[PDB]
Paper text:
Here, we explore the precise structural inhibitory mechanism of actinonin, which is a slow, tight-binding inhibitor of peptide deformylase (PDF), a metal cation-dependent enzyme. The function of the active-site metal is to activate the reactive water molecule involved in peptide hydrolysis.
In this respect, site-directed mutagenesis of AtPDF was performed on Gly41, Ile42, and Ile130. In contrast, the 3D structure of the G41M variant showed that the asymmetric unit was composed of two molecules with distinct structures. One molecule (chain A) is in the O state and is similar to the structures of the WT and the G41Q variant (zone “O”).
Residue numbers in the entry: 1 to 181
The structure:
């Protein structure tokens, strides 16, 4: 199981809705939770482990044997709160890189569960923050897209280092460039 890193094009590719709720989905969900616990995360979207499908696994407590294991298939955020708050965000696709992002404080979410049944939930505080970040992955959106220009200045070099690393690894030109901003 492989964690994808920026600027890998998997992180910007279109993510397909899931229509069949079967054992392939069960097995992928188990593997995604296990990556999530191994990496000390509260949520994990599928493109981050290399699969372009609309799937997130989530434990608001982020601790084994605690909280709830939530699977969100084809999720939609139906409502964002008007109140916006700053927080220093990280991302598994950008190892060691953190910076301030402002997002709504709370959200309301519609999705389908592992058996295909509709449910909805509301999140606030750290869970709403992590949720929005991983949901953005599902739409091919990355956390520096949400950053102000001043915050982006502070990590531009760390990002260019990632772009040069992709070029070294593949021999292909970096598919996107932060200097375009
Ligand atoms: Zn397992
Ligand atoms: Zn597990
Ligand atoms: Zn922890
Ligand atoms: Zn991320
Ligand atoms: Zn430069």
């Amino acid at each position: 199981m492989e964690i994808v890193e920026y600027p890998d094009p998997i992180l910007r590719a279109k993510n397909k809705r899931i229509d069949i709720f079967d054992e392939n989905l069960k097995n992928l969900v188990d593997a995604m939770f296990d990556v999530m616990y191994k990496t000390d995360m509260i949520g994990l979207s599928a493109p981050q482990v290399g699969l372009n499908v609309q799937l997130m696994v989530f434990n608001p407590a982020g601790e084994p044997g605690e909280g709830k294991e939530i699977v969100l298939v084809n999720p939609k955020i139906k409502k964002y709160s008007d109140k916006l708050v700053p927080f220093d965000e990280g991302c598994l696709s950008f190892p060691g890189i953190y910076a301030e992002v402002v997002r709504p404080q709370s959200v309301k979410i519609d999705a389908r569960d592992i058996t295909g049944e509709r449910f909805s939930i509301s999140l606030s505080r750290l869970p709403a923050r992590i949720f929005q970040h991983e949901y953005d992955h599902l739409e091919g959106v990355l956390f520096f897209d949400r950053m102000t220009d001043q915050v982006l200045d502070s990590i531009r070099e760390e990002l260019e280092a990632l772009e040069k690393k992709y070029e070294e690894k593949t021999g292909l030109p970096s598919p996107e460039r932060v200097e375009a901003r």
